[PDB]
């Protein structure tokens, strides 16, 4: 999977798309625009290097390379930005609908083959490499061409050609007064016709719920941190890849701008001597350290040489029982080690055998790890990791090795001596009841970083000029009211049984 | 393929965060 | 109990 995702938003501009079934409801055009804006925001937050486009079919005006009739390409394939969202915002309301009608027009005839041709031409215009090519059709007319059979055949042929070229097609049907049935025409155009997607739908498609669900977390494509050599001996060597399944998320680095005109400014740091005032090259400087009331001087090259112990890679040291590993010895986030056959052929078989036997014997491979050059070595343990899949066969635990760093003697600290007092069974039972009352199921993705979410919300509000930023609800805050309601009188009994009458914990 | 994100292909649709839900 | 020259 290499390249970029290109997406085209086809929006129908027929009369039926501007009628509301109920007074308190959103017209199809409004829902389509809202979905497009939500997708734009999600793409900006997650993947800003992707390509998106917005086109209209059924309008009176035309704007395209081929100069077809009644097709207006509002936005060509380009990276998303706040300007495009602001431009789309002028069609959100009813006033926006009137503005759209005045600017473009609506209620005119059209041919789907020409629309698909324009979409294909837009796809061809892109000069980058595209991993995916997708089109979504927002419409509420299940029979766009019922009077003319030739137009339907042309549309089917164009859809088949697009499928052959490798263009995916999706139909996001919108609510219709009489119901939208896909069986009339859209079976052939739609790339995949699901077994359940054959009945008549009296309501908008469920995919719009997914589209409107804003995603505010950066998504990073698979990448190998390093490609190292595992050396069972001076003659036996295999190639492995190291990945980081868990990585801390940081706010995007701030940029420095000029106040007057609002354009980037570039910085540069230069060292100079005080007396002469001229520039000082790195070769005319040294390093010093004061120990024992004396000055020790070393050159930069020697200073970097001080960290050279062994060449980068993993060096085998033996095998250790898994019981000797301690959970409370965590020092650094763990990594994932996987085979790589590109550099060495035959590594996969040896790695698989090692993993299988380590799982069978419940052992972990102790190793010396040196990620890069001029880096002091560390001690790591490779723990076997089996492949675990969920109910839907979607892999949740990949197979390989888990690299966990082990601490040195310096990394540990001494704790003050404290006397130990043991609680009687009654207090333990009361606290057991309290703990059981607040039982809940935990998972790795049940919490969100409030700081990052708030930063993204503020940035979006500033970019799009919203009246007030959206306030993110923090799931990390304890639900004091719920816990108090659930526990009931247990807390009072525990406090009576564990604390003296006059204790005053707060003070 | 099943349960795939409609915004970012190649990635599974991450479910919404639910925080703590007592039994 | 290392103490003296060893501490």
């Amino acid at each position: 999977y290499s390249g970029r995702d290109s997406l085209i938003f086809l929006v129908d501009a027929s009369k039926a798309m501007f009628e509301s079934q109920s007074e308190d409801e959103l017209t199809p055009f409004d829902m389509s625009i809202q979905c497009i804006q939500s997708v734009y925001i999600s793409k900006i937050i997650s993947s800003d290097r992707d390509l998106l486009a917005v086109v209209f079919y059924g309008t009176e005006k035309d704007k395209n390379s081929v100069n077809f009739k009644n097709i207006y390409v509002l936005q060509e394939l380009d990276n998303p930005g706040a300007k495009r969202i602001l431009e789309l915002d002028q069609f959100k309301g009813q006033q926006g609908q009137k503005r759209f009608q005045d600017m473009m027009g609506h209620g005119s005839d059209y041919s789907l083959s020409e629309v698909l041709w324009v979409c294909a031409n837009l796809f061809s215009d892109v000069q980058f490499k595209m991993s995916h090519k997708r089109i979504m059709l927002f419409t509420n007319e299940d029979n766009p061409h019922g009077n003319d059979s030739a137009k339907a055949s042309r549309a089917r042929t164009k859809a088949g050609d697009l499928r052959d070229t490798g263009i995916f097609l999706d139909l996001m049907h919108l609510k219709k007064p009489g119901g939208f049935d896909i069986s009339l025409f859209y079976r052939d155009i739609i790339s995949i016709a699901e077994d359940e997607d054959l009945r008549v739908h009296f309501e908008e498609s469920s995919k719009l719920e997914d589209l409107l669900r804003k995603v505010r977390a950066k998504e990073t494509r698979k990448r190998a941190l390093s490609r190292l050599k595992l050396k069972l001996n001076k003659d036996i060597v295999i190639s492995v890849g190291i990945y980081n399944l868990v990585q801390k998320a940081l706010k995007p680095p701030p940029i420095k701008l000029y106040r007057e005109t609002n354009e980037p400014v570039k910085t540069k740091t230069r060292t100079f001597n005080t007396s002469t005032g001229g520039l000082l090259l790195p070769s005319d400087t040294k390093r010093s350290q004061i120990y024992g009331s004396r000055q020790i001087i070393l050159e930069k090259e020697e200073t970097e040489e001080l960290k050279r112990f062994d060449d980068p890679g993993l060096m085998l040291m033996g095998f250790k029982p898994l019981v000797l590993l301690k959970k409370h010895h965590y020092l650094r986030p763990s990594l994932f080690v996987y085979p790589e056959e590109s550099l060495v052929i035959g590594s996969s078989t040896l790695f698989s055998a090692l993993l299988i036997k380590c799982l069978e014997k419940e052992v972990a491979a102790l190793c010396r790890y040196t990620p890069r050059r001029n880096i002091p070595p560390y001690f790591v343990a490779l723990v076997p990791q089996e492949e675990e899949l969920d109910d839907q066969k979607i892999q949740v635990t990949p197979p390989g090795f888990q690299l966990v760093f082990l601490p040195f003697a310096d990394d540990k600290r001494k704790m003050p001596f404290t006397e130990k007092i043991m609680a009687t069974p009654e207090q333990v039972g009361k606290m057991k009841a309290i703990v059981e009352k607040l039982r809940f199921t935990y998972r790795s993705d049940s919490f969100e970083n409030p700081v990052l979410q708030q930063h993204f919300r503020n940035l979006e509000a500033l970019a799009l000029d919203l009246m007030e930023p959206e306030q993110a609800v923090d799931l990390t805050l304890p639900k004091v009211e719920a816990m108090n309601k659930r526990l009931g009188s247990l807390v009072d009994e525990f406090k009576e049984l564990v604390y003296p009458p006059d204790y005053n914990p707060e003070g | 393929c099943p349960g795939e994100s409609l915004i970012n292909p190649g990635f599974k649709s991450k479910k919404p965060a639910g925080g703590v839900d007592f039994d | 109990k290392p103490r003296g020259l060893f501490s």
Binding site: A217, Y258, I345, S348, P399, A423, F447, Q454, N458 | - | -
Partner: protein
């Protein structure tokens, strides 16, 4: 914290000659003293070292009297260790012909300690005697010396070149043993070290040590239950306290070099812009939206600092080690001098241990610290029990990568012989020994007890540069490599399995 150590040596002729097949005792004592002073110099514990030698031609002592207390010199007074002391031991310390009794040396050492101890808070005092016991013993003041040592609370340690000796050495050893029994008793017998043993232990620089800051807080379960707790950092990536200082190559001074920052615009003219006109911003897609620092602080996420709340309790199976995040581990005990808090914490720990549960909690160091979601689990030992807290990941920190399955891969399916070879390799390279008598595992290669080689290398290079201003840096010490490698038995046992694995597995570089 402070410690005043008086090192008493001798330069009598009895050490100037020894068996040619082994190093002379004088050389061993010199090496031990050098290693001790090196460790003290590179470990800034503010300890004081004095040096006295008995058995020299000269005489320089606070107390002279008559023939007693003679032939002894206080070479170096009590003060902080320095490279000057290393130079002094390198050259100034010289052998001699005159003999001397070590009892006079001990009395003069205590006199020096008593005189120089006043004015400073030296909570510990030690006297190390390096002698061969060849000289005769003037045992006439043992009662008073013992009484004074007990009154002043001054510890005594002796070093001898043996762990086939003359009767004089046997008598000296017996008198030494009696003195140690009088001072402490049975345990004193463990304080008589040999030169080889001292060399073995003092071959590594002192590990970097830092004192954790006690962090008080309140563990809250709901809104009515609170337990006073104290947290300390237990495991963290230790770094070097000192940092390299940029100095000029010619004048060797850091006052003549400074750093300047210049801001300009993306234009041919290269216009210069002051710092006051620089604003902060961020990139939103293909554009840049200004975001001033003041506005960012105004709209920043504000939370109450110093919070330790229990979000909930979950089964230990649901929390996996591979998800642990952060760069520290916290040990949480009850508030000091608080029995009620200790009882509450013990009850919680015991309940969690019995139910096989852990606490998902919210942790915030202070107001400026970002909130974190972590896991606290019980840690019960035969003597102390507490909680261990480790950070947990967020939704944004999880990466969903897909990897092909290896178990059901036809291309990379191992054969039976390959599996047998791998099993033999694993068995041969075992790093743990199963003692059947106690049915217990013993660690052959404890990694946690190995000092970091980085600091050892840095200190060795700094010392070599200091003592040899103009000389290339040496190679890595052999003992560092030995301690960074497994015992020779493991390597020897793994040769045949490794050769078999190499034969069975075809590996071709591309």
């Amino acid at each position: 914290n402070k410690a005043a150590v008086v090192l008493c040596m001798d330069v009598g002729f009895t050490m100037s000659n020894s068996i040619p097949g082994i190093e002379s005792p004088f050389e061993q004592a010199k090496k031990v003293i050098t290693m001790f002073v090196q460790r003290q110099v590179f470990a800034e514990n503010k300890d004081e070292i004095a040096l006295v030698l008995f058995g020299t031609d000269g005489t320089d002592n606070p107390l002279s009297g008559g023939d007693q207390y003679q032939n002894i010199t206080v070479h170096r007074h009590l003060m902080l260790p320095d490279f000057d002391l290393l130079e002094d031991i390198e050259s100034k310390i010289q052998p001699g012909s005159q003999q001397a009794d070590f009892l006079d040396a001990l009395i003069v050492s205590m006199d020096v300690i008593q005189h120089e101890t006043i004015g400073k808070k030296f909570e510990k005092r030690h006297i190390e005697i390096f002698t061969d016991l060849s000289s005769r013993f003037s045992k006439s003041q043992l009662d008073i010396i013992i009484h004074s040592l007990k009154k002043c609370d001054i510890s005594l340690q002796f070093f001898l070149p043996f762990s086939g000796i003359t009767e004089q050495q046997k008598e000296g050893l017996e008198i030494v043993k009696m003195v140690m029994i009088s001072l402490e008793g049975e345990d004193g017998l463990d304080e008589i070290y040999s030169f080889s043993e001292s060399l073995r232990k003092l071959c590594v620089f002192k590990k970097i040590e830092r004192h954790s800051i006690h962090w008080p807080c309140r563990l809250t379960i709901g809104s009515n239950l609170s337990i006073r707790i104290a947290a300390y950092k237990s495991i963290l990536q230790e770094r070097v306290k000192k940092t390299w200082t940029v100095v000029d190559a010619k004048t060797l001074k850091k006052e003549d070099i400074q750093k300047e920052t210049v801001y300009c615009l993306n234009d041919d003219d290269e216009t210069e812009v002051l710092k006051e006109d620089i604003i902060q911003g961020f990139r939103y897609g293909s554009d840049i939206v200004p975001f001033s620092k003041v506005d960012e602080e105004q709209m920043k996420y504000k939370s109450e600092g110093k919070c330790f709340s229990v979000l909930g309790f979950c089964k230990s199976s649901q929390v996996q080690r591979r998800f642990f995040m952060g760069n520290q581990v916290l040990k949480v005990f009850a508030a000091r001098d608080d029995e009620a808090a200790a009882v509450a914490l013990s009850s919680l720990i015991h309940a969690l241990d019995d139910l096989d549960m852990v606490a998902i909690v919210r942790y915030a160091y202070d107001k400026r610290a970002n909130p974190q979601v972590g896991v606290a689990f019980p840690h019960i030992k035969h003597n102390y029990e507490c909680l261990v807290y480790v950070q947990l990941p967020f939704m944004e920190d999880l990466r969903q990568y897909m990897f092909s399955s290896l178990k059901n891969s036809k291309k990379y399916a191992p054969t039976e012989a390959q599996l047998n070879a791998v099993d033999a390799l694993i068995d041969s390279m075992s790093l743990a020994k199963k003692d059947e008598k106690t049915d217990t595992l013993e660690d052959l290669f404890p990694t946690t007890k190995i000092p970091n080689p980085r600091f050892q290398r840095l200190f060795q290079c700094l010392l070599h540069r200091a003592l040899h201003p103009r000389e290339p840096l040496p190679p890595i010490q052999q003992h560092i490599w030995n301690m960074l490698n497994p015992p020779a038995e493991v390597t020897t046992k793994s040769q045949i399995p490794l050769s078999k694995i190499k034969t069975l597995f075809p590996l071709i570089e591309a």
